[PDB]
């Protein structure tokens, strides 16, 4: 298994929230309107602040958050801001309850994968090792060689007695742990293998390198799902390669955990739980919430933030029993429910300006008004989508700056969900 690993995050999901850099709160925990990328919604933000403070204070004993509000609200954005306020490089794993419905994977098998995406591993270890082939062994002076470079060392008696333990003589290839083998050159064409011959450390005689890396438990999983002799096909063509994903196995995960605990024991790495955000929480069933209940208890588990835009819904896995937001009582009990409000036209115009200046598409003040009226009529979701098409229709006849005529044609070329249906119904 390997320590250094690459991480391919699903950035498609936080692409509409690239302006959200935080919650934008005062020193006294009071929300500043139009700060940190946010605009209004001060109540929900200040509430998240208490959640972020409760987490850091460890007073968040086996509890979770639930964001209740309509579509256009800042539910997903708030969750993202929470992970940001919780520190640096904190794992954020946003999902929808509809994702766990998989053909070849159990609902909780999917949840478990996402928990791993929301559990980070901060590795801040500095490794200093003097390596190479031995040349001297004499107040103890030992020499080492590299591809280009040679160092003569000055050793204490304590190390030469620990060197007496390891199979070491001149000249062999050796490794040195500062804080805590036949060289390739002597190989004859007549030897072949099995062999004891290995190359000389190229091309440095020293190695005081600093290991700085942050990765999720899932980044480790996928990194070790490929054998030596193959490429990273899982993160290249994930779902497309085959129907069932048999590469990541149970034995492989527990080997990771076995390794992860080892790095922690050596004070080398700290595992930092992040934020698991689940939209459409009413889509989860009883067996899903039973798993989440166990998750809320563990000390080394990510904060579980749920979201729902349904007031009352049937508890899935129950006989037509309806409850608040589709959440069971046994689990709703452990949630701090934070309500998200809809936006005023001036709040919507501001958000559009922020998004447009981020895209970043330039548009007139009349255009912003037209795009915001769809933020009132339809969701804030739909109207924000109108920017791209209008910008294209402009640039094509550009007139690079977007106008009202452009948003006017765009709103007719690309209808929202409700319009498209009611028009087709007729």
């Amino acid at each position: 298994q390997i320590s250094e690993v690459r991480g391919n995050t699903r950035d498609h999901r936080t692409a509409a929230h690239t302006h959200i850099k935080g919650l934008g709160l005062n020193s006294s925990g009071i929300a500043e309107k139009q700060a940190a990328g946010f605009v209004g919604q001060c109540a929900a933000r200040e509430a998240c602040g208490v959640v972020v403070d409760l987490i850091k204070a460890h007073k968040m004993a086996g509890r979770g958050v639930l964001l209740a509000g309509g579509p256009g609200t800042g539910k997903t954005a708030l969750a993202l801001a929470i992970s940001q306020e919780l520190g640096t490089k904190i794992p954020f794993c946003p999902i929808t309850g509809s994702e766990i419905y998989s053909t070849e994977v159990k609902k909780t098998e999917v949840l478990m994968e996402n928990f791993r995406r929301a559990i980070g591993l901060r590795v801040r270890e500095t490794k200093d090792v003097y390596e190479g082939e031995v040349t001297e062994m004499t107040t103890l002076l030992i020499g080492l060689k590299s591809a280009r470079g040679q160092k003569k060392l000055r050793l204490d008696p304590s190390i030469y007695e620990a060197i007496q333990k390891e199979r070491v003589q001149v000249g062999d290839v050796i490794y040195i742990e500062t804080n805590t083998g036949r060289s390739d050159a002597y190989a004859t064409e007549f030897d072949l293998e099995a062999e004891e011959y290995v190359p000389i450390p190229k091309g440095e005689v020293h190695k005081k390198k600093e290991i700085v890396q942050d990765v999720t438990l899932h980044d480790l999983d996928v990194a070790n799902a490929r054998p030596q002799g193959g490429q990273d096909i899982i993160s290249m063509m994930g779902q497309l390669m085959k129907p069932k994903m048999t590469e990541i196995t149970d034995k492989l995960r527990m080997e990771i955990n076995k390794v992860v605990q080892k790095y922690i024991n050596q004070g080398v790495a700290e595992l930092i739980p992040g934020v698991l955000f689940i939209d459409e929480a009413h889509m989860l069933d009883i067996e899903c919430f039973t798993y989440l209940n166990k998750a809320l208890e563990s000390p080394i588990a990510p904060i579980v933030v749920l979201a729902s835009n349904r007031g009352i819904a049937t508890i899935r896995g129950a006989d037509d029993l309806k409850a608040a937001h589709g959440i069971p009582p046994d689990f709703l009990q452990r949630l701090l429910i934070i309500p998200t409000h809809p936006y005023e036209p001036d709040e919507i115009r501001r958000i559009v300006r922020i998004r447009a200046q981020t895209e970043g598409v330039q548009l007139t003040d009349a255009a912003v008004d037209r795009v915001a009226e769809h933020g009132v009529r339809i969701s804030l979701r739909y109207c924000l989508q109108l920017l791209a098409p209008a910008s294209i229709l402009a640039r094509v006849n550009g007139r690079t700056q977007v106008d009202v005529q452009d948003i006017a044609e765009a709103e007719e070329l690309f209808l929202d969900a409700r319009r498209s249906a009611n028009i087709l119904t007729s």
């Binding site: 699903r10 498609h12 692409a15 579509p71 929808t96 509809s98 994702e99 766990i100 419905y101 998989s102 053909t103 070849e104 193959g230 490429q231 990273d232 096909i233 290249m236 063509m237 994930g238 779902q239 497309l240 390669m241 085959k242 129907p243 069932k244 048999t246 939209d279 459409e280 889509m283 049937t314 895209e359 979701r381 989508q385 791209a388 098409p389 294209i392 229709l393 094509v396 006849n397 765009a410 007719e412 070329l413 690309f414 209808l415 929202d416 969900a417 409700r418 498209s420 249906a421 009611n422 028009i423 087709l424 119904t425 007729s426």
Partner: protein, 419 residues
């Protein structure tokens, strides 16, 4: 051998610089809003922040939404994979839902490489029909070649006949009309020298075709034997690693195509999970979906939404809409599909088919073309007339008349309503 990713319409019929759609050149007919909307989406895709989004084409039955998807596929270029899948075909005994979806997606992802091949180039002389044999020559020699079903298809698709200068890839069977020697479009002169030459050419094959090529060739009468159509994972793993190696090397380039899923309201929550997971890979193609429903149930749950998509999905999709063709457009479409089926209509005949197309739909009107052709033939009539379109209309019913007719056994009134 193999088969290249060319498996009618040449584009969206849109101004290259304005994106303003000329009505019928490419040719699509009408649906100018939907076609301009498509051009914008494509421009959004070609470069920008579209970022892994599906495209939903909603509209009444027998609109042009299926054709637009191909119109979108061509705008990306020839030898760019375009695969069409009816959402219900995902449900079968031949293979699981996950398998069918994997093949469909892998049919839309092309692997492109440069390799030598035996390509032919010559002026066609004759072509025959059976229940064929291509004569091709150069200024140096003439030859007769035999061919089967798959071959004769691709040629008639590329619109080839005597006098056409064509190009045939003996390794993939890719036909290419270069021009014409005389009139009966580009006026080229007859090829000189050897009829068959070995040249370096670009080959684009889908990930699925590669999977099929490296599997035991399907037995004759495969359909009516119990043989399943799934592909062994060990074969896929073999193909995946080599394609990944070729990409690292530089031998191969991945060409994401277009996957068009019709009647997408047949998919369940699990299908939409897959489609969501597939769109999250860089190799992922452009998923384009078409629905005939205003509002439908989300299969897998007890929730209803527009077109029957999960509310999560709808927030991600780009929605294009089509509308009922105008009578002039119907008349133009049916007249085109008439000459393509080789039917000589009377001005009145086409007029009645158009009126039929209005009342019962475009597909039904189209069905009546061939039936009318045969009725005219039985008559020995010189041209297909209205007398034939009318008689086929009385013989072969459309769905609406059919259900009404069958309901006619239990009827509800003579003087007044009864029940």
């Amino acid at each position: 051998s193999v088969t290249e990713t060319k498996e009618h319409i040449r584009g969206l019929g849109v101004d290259a610089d304005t994106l303003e759609p000329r009505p019928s050149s490419q040719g699509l007919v009408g649906q100018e809003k939907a076609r301009k909307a498509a051009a914008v989406v494509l421009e959004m895709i070609k470069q920008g922040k579209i970022a892994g989004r599906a495209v939903l084409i909603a509209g009444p039955p027998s609109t042009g939404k299926t054709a637009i998807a191909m119109g979108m596929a061509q705008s990306l270029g020839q030898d760019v994979p375009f695969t069409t899948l009816a959402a219900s075909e995902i449900f079968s005994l031949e293979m699981s839902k996950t398998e069918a979806l994997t093949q469909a997606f892998r049919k839309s992802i092309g692997v492109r490489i440069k390799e030598e091949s035996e390509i032919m180039e010559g002026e066609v002389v004759e072509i025959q029909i059976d229940r064929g044999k291509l004569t091709i020559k150069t200024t140096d020699m003439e030859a007769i070649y035999d061919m089967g079903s798959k071959m004769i298809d691709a040629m008639t698709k590329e619109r080839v006949m005597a006098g056409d200068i064509i190009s045939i890839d003996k390794s993939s069977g890719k036909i290419t009309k270069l021009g014409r020697s005389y009139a009966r479009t580009k006026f080229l002169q007859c090829p000189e020298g050897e009829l068959q030459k070995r040249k370096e050419v670009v080959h684009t094959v889908s990930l699925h075709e590669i999977d099929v090529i490296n599997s035991r060739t399907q037995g004759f009468l495969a359909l009516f034997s119990g043989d399943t159509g799934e592909i062994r994972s060990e074969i896929r793993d073999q193909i995946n690693t080599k394609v990944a190696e070729w990409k690292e090397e530089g031998k191969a380039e991945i060409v994401p195509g277009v996957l068009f899923i019709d009647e997408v309201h047949m998919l369940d929550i699990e299908c939409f999970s897959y489609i969501n997971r597939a769109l999250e890979s860089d190799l992922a193609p452009i998923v384009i979906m078409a629905s005939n429903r205003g509002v439908s149930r989300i299969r897998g749950t007890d929730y209803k939404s527009p077109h029957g998509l999960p509310l999560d999905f709808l927030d991600r999709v780009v929605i294009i809409n089509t509308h009922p063709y105008t009578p002039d457009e119907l008349r133009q479409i049916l007249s085109i599909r008439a000459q393509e089926e080789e039917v000589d209509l009377t001005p009145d005949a086409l007029a009645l088919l158009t009126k039929i197309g209005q009342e019962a739909g475009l597909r039904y009107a189209s069905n009546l073309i061939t039936t009318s052709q045969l009725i005219a033939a039985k008559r020995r009539a010189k041209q297909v007339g209205v007398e034939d379109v009318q008689r086929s209309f009385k013989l072969f019913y459309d769905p609406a008349r059919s259900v009404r007719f069958v309901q006619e056994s239990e009827k509800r009134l003579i003087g007044n309503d009864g029940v």
